[PDB]
Amino acid sequence: IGNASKTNYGVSLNEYIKLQQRNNPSNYSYSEFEKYINPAKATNKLQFLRIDKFRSVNVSGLSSRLSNKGVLTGQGQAFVNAAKAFNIDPIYLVAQCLHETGNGTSKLAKGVTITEIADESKPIYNGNGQLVGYHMIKLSKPVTVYNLFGIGAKDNSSVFPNRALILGTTYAYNRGWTSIENAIKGAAEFVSLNYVHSSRYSQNTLYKMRYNQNVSNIWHQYATTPWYASSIADIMRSYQDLYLENNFTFDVPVFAG
After folding, report:
1. Measuring CA to CA, which residue among 13, 62, 12, 55 is closest to residue 34?
2. Does an H or E element contain 206, and which?
3. Do residues 143 and 173 make contact, with C-beta atoms less than 8 angstroms apart?
């Protein structure tokens, strides 16, 4: 929108695409990066919406719209409560969670009934000195834990193929994510403190979360797919009629050339 501020990336579009390509742990083409980074190719302006403020929504209308979303079905109240607590945009939070959980269907999101948690201070190494486990802690009953964003769920190795599940379920237990409501609050906290309301990072639009405006901070980006911010903005468009007011502010990237 014309009523938008601009954030200078301070390098050319071409230089920025080349920095993203060389820093990404996965290999994507210049072409794939260019069509998602170039702001003139954005069809969906919601990737530039400032999400660092709570915006009122029709809560019952949101619960109704979350029709067939697995563990997130009907959970309008939990999403609005979480967004209000962290002063973030609730339609952004809904869209972020829907994308990250596959519409409420991912293993960690649907809930894992664990009978033990990891002690990460007591790792266990194989013959080739590679990590294969941790000394585990008995729980007095089976506990169902939820993790929407796989927070704490550090990468699987060939020799530890369930590492993300062990650490994702242990992190969820240790945060008290024993309900979908508490897991939604945990997801909102993660994006708020780390990205959206960080005074150091100021990653307060979907575009900025994926494509850091400060080239020195390129390591601090939420995801690696080139289309990540575009995918979440497309989900937000599905829900955009649920706002109760017309208080929208946008921040658009600009490049040196």
Report:
1. 13
2. helix 206-210
3. yes
Residues 214, 111: contact at Cβ < 8 Å? no
From the list 226, 216, 169, 219, the residue with the least C-alpha distance to 194 is 219
Of the candidates 181, 187, 165, the one whose C-alpha atom is nearest the C-alpha of residue 96 is 187
CA distance 222 to 194: 9
Resolution in A: 1.6
Nearest 5°: the CA angle 236, 240, 243 is 130
Tokens at 132, concatenated: 């294969």
Cα separations in angstroms, 218 against 16, 205, 226: 10, 15, 14
d(C-alpha 147, C-alpha 70), whole Å = 14
In order, the DSSP letters of 52-94 are SS---B-HHHHHHH--S-GGGTTTHHHHHHHHHHHT--HHHHH
Residues facing 114 on adjacent strands: 143
This entry's atomic model was obtained through: X-ray
What are the tokens at 186?
Answer: 């945990």
Q: Which amino acid, one-letter code, is at 229? A: A
Question: How would you class 240 by CB atoms within 10 Å of its CB: exposed for 0-12, middle for 13-18, buried for 19 or more?
Answer: middle
Report the C-alpha gap between 14 and 34 in whole angstroms: 8
Three-state DSSP state, 133: strand
- Tokens 């400060």 -> residue: 214
Q: Count the Cβ atoms, other than its own, within 10 Å of residue 115.
A: 11
Q: Is residue 121 packed enough to be buried (19+ CB in 10 Å), middle (13-18) or exposed (0-12)?
A: exposed
